Symmetry: D2
Subunit: 312 residues, 4 copies
């Protein structure tokens, strides 16, 4: 409950950590598509939004960037919220996979919602029946509520490039169709289209931190008081972000940082400190694992300083 | 050189083995598409064609059926014949894979030409540049020469069903595209189309046995004297049929039968006894491994009786 | 901080859950050795020990049983406590493995301290230099402090049976020696002996719950006020128990229960509710995964009722 | 039947190939034990022994060296010869494994007799009941018959070093014991001892080539006319040498050379040309795969020149 004693002083520490992370210039900006290669390796922003509704930003916190995989926890939350744990998990697993890297697990289901095959299946469960345009509007609405109506855009350029370039996602798409992993009567190619769109949704560190804070606040948006996601949805999302949100670094991350988080190839890291605050770190240069270098650094420092680790 | 002493007497033994195999009624006729489910489980034919040009058939040896995977050795032979060992193998491996069942190997190449991913890549190497209609005519011509101009048809029904149903081959198709496994400028979807057509080519035990005899005769068609395939092509094809031609039964088959062979889901088994004869066994009911039950039985008996095993 | 409002009332709920679990009669009592087969499938005990020092038991909470794998978290805590995170992890990983089931990971290290290969390596790090008798006394002392000097015995019968029967642990032992996984100059066979002894240490639900409470209390024994383990040791142990403490059920467990726990083939389940209490459930009949049936049931019920899940 | 036209001229070609291979100075002499590191990288010998009984040697063909893995085909032949295909294969598989590298396969049996786990199991089947000294004498006798009584020694130094250093073979030993892979009442540690001895048996290129010729001659020693191995034994051995005799190079070897062969860490390569001749190439420097560099080179050249490939 009693988060941080003095928020203003906490703010001062965020800035120090931010400054320290700024010195980390390693990594490479994703470049499989021009829309990602465009970004400057020097962009670096950190936005905080407590359960209180208190805000604080430092760095490039108003420059829009694509959620990419950061959207995975979000659409999963939405699915559980509208369909419940039981139904959703008839189509997707609940744990980290081994590491080469099969699309399905022992039961012919994607290992979890945080890997592509999983996110693709989860995408096929949301608002079934209506057209893609409607489904897309539906999720945008949902993301707006989580962000307390702050910035939520869309990158058509990214969407177009992701589609006419995601051969691997199509491989996954057909494979899942082959294994009957989708709900009866699913238009697979149409689902991949919806999936590419969701990955192309844009946010800023500021609006994203509010989304994170909503998850940190048991499903209530810290700046509107509104209930956006069901308790069940939030807990599931957090559990999976804890164990599968940082790609191949998930294990190390859970051990050293101990916080629910989710990274994206755009350089973002959606971080959550349960009952305390939500955060969004962003910096285009990624490491071998695919996580934002400055972001990973900052997260370690934050936990070592404020003792935020799940088991402190 | 000195094959079998008396061919007429050998013929009498073929009939006995054929009759013995006829008692084996186990297995299930493939049924993932209606064109295969249609077949009667009782169809059973065995055609022999020696290096001499001597023929002999017993059973349903004139009922057309699709080559399916039996065409894999054949198109591979063609590729090596027109492009040479070195070039072809820049795109496909030369050995059996482990067993779950990755599309690519350590070097991002399909393990060998006998598995789907391999056959698909091999298909992309033949007669590059021309349209599919032309490529198809080209291979048909080639198959005719191997069969000494005997029956070589095409099943449009099978082709159509294979296409609008091969989700797994499409998964493989996109995956290979993703890993840059095809030659520069390959139209992947167009290649899968050519691949489905090749699998739909029809033969009879009689015309197929002539094809096998051509491979048994170092590349010369036993009934026309013509050189159809280069020595290099024939040896490669035989080596791979020896180790990867019977799906997951390849190991057992190489150990107990010791002959170059290739099975197909239609129930066919293209068998080759180097410098002696070519054969084609056919019977729709397959076992767990996917091989023709009567066919597998007959092959074991043939080797136990005539001591045809590679190492006798 | 504010654990449960009224402990006496909480006690009443424990008894209800205990009674409910009692109806679950499935599973099989381990029987690879007679010392385990001896146990009655009806034994069922649950002991609670809060951070306050408040106690409560129900069922067979005074019948001694072997820790078996339950000792893994405990000796790991000890290693980190005396050697620090960095040193210990030069020899053992920090995450769940895939699932067949290799002894080592990508870096030739046991995946984590909760699997046999890991526990064996961890065992080789404790009190290096002294003889086994001394090492054993050292750990017993440590376990006594964690249990606030309550019951901590030893089963010579189990120890003897485990040794002259653990062919697989010996396979692991030699393999690790082969891969130079032990500290310079380690007597491998001697280490396996120490390992078998540690698995043979006996506790009761009551003394074990105190051990769990010590971990729940940041390293301080709830009934002596003494500092037994360093904060670093406790946090590491808890993180790994969260992700690797329930064998192949770890994933499901982390998702549905969300609590640090560790099971043992004797039927015990060391459970920990951070900053609230420690617990020890015990019931010999195990499920396919190897976890106590009644124990697994009880744990699910406890979290569904008291909302103890890490992310509630 | 009609091997090579003129043997004397063939001899002249062997010398040319031998000379050509001599220029290949790559590779590293095994050095996990001093008894192997001792060898000069320049040693290079090639001995030929036809089915006729005609001999020819070039290079260091009288310098003794350990069979090491070259003994695997030989003891397997012996097992099949005394127990028959059926019995032997209740304990060991018949095919190449995948590639990390599990000790057992799907049925809990070593994949084949050519890998360590397999050879160890095969070793436990020979002359059961008698003591190791007797078993050893028994196999020595057998090897003498295959070598037409030519050089067959023993390296006690190698044996001692292999034992007090084969941690991995012990891991395999205990693992197999754990999976009940040995015949009822097998003294596992005693079997590993017999296994280390068999690997320490010494031969020269000359005596080994005679052993190979015996296999090439359907089980009859070319220089004594005696029947040493049953036809069944020889065919099985050859089939497995064809597919599993060159470690991880087996696939490539079967494709490009197409001859039954078996390599050893001492630098030897037991080669067999069915119904023509037996050979033994030896040169201490091995490649990444573990095969003799000069040996591999020579074998390729031999087949390209004399068209000895199984499918020429
Ligand atoms: N579980 C799986 N099996 N095969 C896949 C394709 C690679 S995924
Ligand atoms: N070699 C490979 N890695 N992943 C594949 C997809 C399953 S194939
Ligand atoms: N990582 C590993 N490779 N092989 C092992 C033996 C099975 S463990
Ligand atoms: N088949 C196998 N499973 N585990 C092994 C130990 C590594 S072998």
């Amino acid at each position: 409950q009693s988060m941080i004693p003095d928020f203003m002083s906490f703010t001062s520490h965020i800035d120090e950590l931010y400054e320290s992370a700024k010195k980390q210039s390693g990594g490479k900006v994703a470049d499989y598509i021009p829309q990602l290669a465009k970004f400057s390796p020097d962009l670096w922003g950190v936005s905080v939004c407590t359960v209180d509704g208190q805000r604080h930003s430092t760095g490039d916190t108003k420059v829009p960037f694509c959620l990419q995989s950061c959207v995975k926890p979000l659409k999963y939350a939405i699915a559980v919220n509208d369909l419940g744990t039981e139904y959703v998990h008839r189509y997707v697993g609940k744990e980290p996979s081994g590491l080469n890297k099969l699309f399905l697990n022992e039961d012919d289901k994607p290992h979890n919602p945080m890997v592509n095959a999983g996110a693709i299946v989860v995408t096929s469960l949301i608002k079934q029946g209506v057209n893609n345009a409607e489904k897309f509007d539906y999720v945008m609405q949902f993301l707006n509520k989580m962000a307390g109506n702050e910035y939520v855009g869309f990158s058509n350029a990214t969407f177009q490039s992701e589609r006419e370039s995601g051969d691997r996602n199509f491989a996954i798409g057909y494979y899942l169709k082959e294994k009957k992993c989708f709900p009866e009567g699913t238009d697979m190619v149409g689902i991949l289209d919806f999936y590419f769109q969701l990955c192309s949704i844009e946010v800023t560190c500021e609006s994203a931190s509010v989304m994170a804070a909503t998850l940190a606040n048991g499903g209530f948006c810290p700046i509107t008081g509104e209930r956006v996601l069901s308790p069940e949805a939030v807990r599931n999302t957090l559990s999976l972000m804890h164990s599968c949100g940082m790609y191949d670094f998930s294990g190390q991350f859970a051990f050293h940082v101990g916080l629910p988080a989710k990274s994206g190839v755009a350089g973002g890291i959606l971080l959550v400190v349960p009952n305390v605050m939500g955060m969004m770190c962003w910096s285009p240069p990624l490491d071998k694992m695919g996580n934002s270098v400055k972001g990973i650094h900052f997260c370690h420092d934050l936990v070592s300083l404020c003792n935020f680790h799940n088991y402190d």
